[PDB]
Symmetry: C4
């Protein structure tokens, strides 16, 4: 595989159409899904030349741990849909690559089993009608050694997934929510989580500048600037279009991650040049899992690491910090 | 039907080609028709997160009545072209949905019959060569319980409808103007109408900012920012491109509606975020009428209501007022 | 014929391919040719409503004569290529429509014969290696009753017409330059012409603002803002993109015409709203001549007059002056 | 051949697919490759009229020598891939046209043999792991009569060429690096070269404004504003998009060349109007070499010279200096 796009072709060959559509699809007309890609394609980097590249490093420190790349595996529900080893296959590959893996509230293997794989696991939280269940998940995650709580704030309820409605998609009987209904979360919910854990709380799905600022004021350790991969509000701005403004507004008060459409090391470099601390990658990780299980995810992460290192050095950056100081230009 | 676009396919299957073209078409090269869609597609919403959504309401108060959604059925001439029940089928579905229905001067069922259906009917006025006939229509509408007069100001004469000219389109003998020639209207005409009724006068087809201001000064209760669905001046700016500027200029002095190309609850949300009080929807209502009569219109209005509620809540808006405070970003 | 585009189809059916290509083609990659159209398509008009339209008039006064529309027939060489009656067919139709016709230096019927048709003829001048020949043409034109000299300033030599080179195009033996080598013209040439005639001198092919200003200072009575229909410099800006700036800079000091890609009454309205005094129309007139001779040109001019009147009134303009006061908005 | 695009078709017919792909391809998704073209296509020139064109000259003085056009042949590795005469065929045609030819460090004929052809040769330098080898190349180039050292600064290592990876491309046994591993170059390397030669040092692959300024401060005699034809960082801005800003920042302190996508005399004119001293042309020269050897390159250079002269005069420029004073407008 020489690009992330070779894996999409392979995943489409193997998965049942309705599962491929659950993975690929977005809400509504899929305008936000498409715009995630368009928005990245319009960003060009202004590389620097003739800098010292004797020891290029792609590592970052985030949430108190060193990561091998400025990237983590995004939360994706129900990974046994894609391969029988599901979350364990992905978590193992992420561990071996030194990349954080986000364990989902809707994981198809229990969070404690996935955490036992090792590595840098984070835990993604959905707020539930029964509040106590959400807070018990947080405590379970912490007890299992998760290192951050990624609170998803953009799903008061699931968006309108027309592919899924047209297909009549439902989980097969062999895939369940192994940790066991959505309730709208509020800033009060954020505070209840912050009070119940010593782990950094990361709010995922922030797009308004004033929500980024309020996240810092609320004691968040990070945010993920994100439109949920075009799966929630159809017509929501891409995160990459808000990122620069958000990074300026928080002025270092929390980590600022971005996601949506990251498909190469070059895209990682764009995100960092716009100011991101790190990116999340969702669909491509699942393409690799579908295509070739743990080995497939390993191969994807190896390719991404090579592309990140290549892009960084070609742009004159010996570190991710230097990459954040790059300028960009919008084009056609 | 899971989107408004499923109904277009169904209407195209059933209607005679020349009737489908009377409905779908615009003037000239159809540049303004296409631009209505392009203009909406370029607008992205910046949603807010973590707000209280315990009681999301899509209702608005407009022209002294509560409406279920920030939407009304646009005036569309000759609805018996599309289904034998014509305007009565649409008006009944609108009533049942709590949406205002605009009875047309060129209705194929008499305005008094349509008004007898009940609901929130408005009445659309064309100025006629015989002035007295226009003013008699106003009095008839008021006597029948219509709640606003929507004075169409963008049709001094009908535009050049090339599909209709190529098809040699004419009304079948079984479709007539049941209320019974266009004369250019002026500001004097507006004043003659205002003096002849106690109902709110709404000027439909305003696109220049200074015409919006003058509408307020003239005593209008509302305007509809509109290029008549691309059917009048070919090359007229889309209403959605003028809306923000217009809303700022009138600074709350009248209701500011918009139309043209509204095809989802997401589009309704864009219009409100740009400042609209409400939208009109034309062609999609007729697609539903063609496809399945009253039931079809009911299904469309149910789908739109679900999409509006979904979009609002995903954007952190418990009310339409909150949606008007959302920011937007233009994209690709 | 219900649009100018119906005539292109008809002309393409009848003309030999190499003649159609001589007519349609531009220089180089035809980037400027295509951009003439793109540039007009991006301009939207902001129409005004509720104005008096009791006596809409499309007339203008230009170069001391009343014209029926704000349009003239552009200079096009060798019109016997397109129809056996050539320039006489076009000139007769223009006369009957009350539109000025520009007689070309490279006319395939002598300028005196065309002028004898009557009407409002103008004369287009090429500067020649033998200066005296150019100045004799001017005197001949004036003696024959031409009312303006349109000095073409953008053809120091003919551009690179790749269609013509690929086709090996040459004039058939039955088409000649009936008035009988290009020399670069300079401001000195302009002055020599101005001194040799009492007619208004119009400089055709101006695109830089400072050249427009200098034209006024040089005593020009008009300019034509133009990239020669994309036939000269490939990559020259469209005239329509320079027009507003030019109109502001000359601040009424001469008439400012535009050409390139005008294909409807709506396009005429755009040009006027951008500030043009009038437009020239080239290729469409020749399509009509190819399709149906004098009658074809008459039909085209009738259609254009109807479209201009329609566009004007739909935009709230009772006169061309009012149309010049319209605002525009650039779109997608 | 009447355009540079006729030669691409001819080269694609004759070359083995993998060699055509080595030539045509870029890094990654080829976003930067495509953007080089897009960026030029959006630039329109504002031509001037009515200037003296009695003695139009396309000559420039650069690096102490007169060149026939504001263009040089870009460094392209391994030209025996394209034709058996390789670099000697191209160098001979360049000499005969009065265009500088850049001899490559990776030339498939030795630099001394190519320099013996005569003409204006420049020498392109790669910095090597063994520094002394790079500096020996510089001395060899100077001893052989090369007139400038073009130090390539954008290849700390070769980019990710996915066409080449998919094809399993490798040099055939009959093509070698005849002058005989990449090491990242730094500003220290630049200074080591500057100290080892009296020739002008030209830094090729500059895109950041501050790197342009530093190049001047470092004693460079020129820079080439360039993204290496889209072959290095995928997502690097096109040079043509940085050029104006760069030209302003150096304010005449060194020659500022540009490359990437130059495919006509019209494109040369755009580059000069944006401020370039001269352009480099890569792929088209190799298309001509593949198609017809020395004669093919001669024909290409003749066509380019004709197009440059044509564009200049149509734009009212009797000299390249005048062309640099032209204004431009971005379009669609
Ligand atoms: C199939 C699928 C399931 C997902 N499930 C979740 C989830 O349970 N929680 C969450 O916060 N995000 C979820 N996401 C969103 C991703 O975390 C991420 O925001 C999105 O996929 C990023 O875009 P990318 O897929 O373009 O890389 C899901 C995304 C996909 C494609
Ligand atoms: C077939 C048809 C007939 C119409 N008749 C009228 C009319 O009689 N009066 C009027 O004010 N608008 C009329 N309109 C315009 C609509 O009220 C509305 O401005 C336009 O359809 C809105 O755009 P939409 O169809 O894209 O939703 C008509 C539109 C269509 C498509
Ligand atoms: C076939 C052809 C021949 C032309 N000959 C002349 C000419 O002799 N003199 C001149 O000033 N313009 C000439 N023009 C340019 C036109 O006057 C005009 O600038 C151009 O056609 C306007 O664009 P349009 O064809 O898009 O309407 C010619 C154009 C065409 C298409
Ligand atoms: C096949 C190929 C090989 C190249 N080899 C070199 C090289 O050895 N050194 C270098 O500085 N540039 C090299 N370049 C880049 C060119 O010098 C130039 O920057 C690029 O081709 C310019 O773009 P153009 O090909 O679009 O005209 C190469 C380009 C191509 C296409
Ligand atoms: O995007 C998803 O599918 C998840 O976030 C879910 F299942 F929660 F909506
Ligand atoms: O758009 C329409 O068809 C109506 O507004 C009419 F019939 F009046 F022009
Ligand atoms: O555009 C044209 O063909 C004319 O202007 C000519 F023939 F002069 F170049
Ligand atoms: O672009 C190229 O192929 C050259 O610059 C090389 F071979 F050095 F990378």
């Amino acid at each position: 595989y020489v690009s992330l796009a070779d894996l999409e072709r392979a995943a489409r060959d193997v998965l049942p159409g309705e599962i491929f559509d659950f993975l690929a699809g977005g809400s509504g007309t899929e305008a936000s899904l498409v715009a995630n890609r368009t928005a990245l394609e319009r960003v060009f980097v202004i590389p620097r030349m003739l800098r010292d590249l004797t020891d290029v490093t792609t590592e970052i420190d985030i949430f108190g741990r060193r990561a091998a790349l400025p990237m983590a595996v995004a939360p994706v529900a129900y990974q046994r849909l894609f391969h029988p080893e599901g979350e364990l296959a992905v978590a193992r590959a992420a561990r071996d690559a030194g990349v954080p893996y986000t364990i989902c509230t809707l994981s198809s293997v229990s969070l404690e089993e996935i955490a036992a794989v090792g590595g840098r696991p984070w835990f993604q939280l959905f707020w539930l009608r029964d509040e106590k269940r959400s807070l018990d998940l947080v405590r379970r995650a912490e007890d299992a050694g998760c290192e951050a709580i990624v609170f998803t704030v953009d799903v008061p309820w699931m968006g309108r997934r027309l592919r899924d409605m047209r297909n009549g998609f439902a989980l097969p009987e062999w895939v369940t929510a192994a940790n066991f209904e959505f309730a709208p979360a509020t800033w009060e919910s954020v505070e209840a989580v912050r009070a119940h854990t010593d782990l950094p709380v990361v709010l995922k799905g922030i797009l308004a500048v004033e929500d980024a600022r309020r996240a810092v004021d609320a004691g968040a350790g990070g945010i993920v600037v994100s439109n949920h991969g075009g799966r929630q509000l159809d017509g929501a701005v891409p995160g990459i279009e808000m990122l620069g403004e958000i990074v300026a507004a928080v002025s270092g008060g929390c980590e600022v991650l971005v996601d949506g459409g990251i498909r190469s090391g070059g895209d990682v470099l764009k995100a960092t040049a716009l100011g991101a601390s790190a990116v999340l990658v969702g669909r491509p990780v699942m393409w690799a899992l579908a295509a070739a299980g743990q080995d497939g995810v390993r191969q994807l992460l190896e390719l991404l690491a090579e592309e990140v290192r290549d892009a960084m050095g070609l742009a004159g950056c010996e570190s991710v910090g230097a990459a954040r100081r790059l300028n960009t230009k919008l084009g056609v």
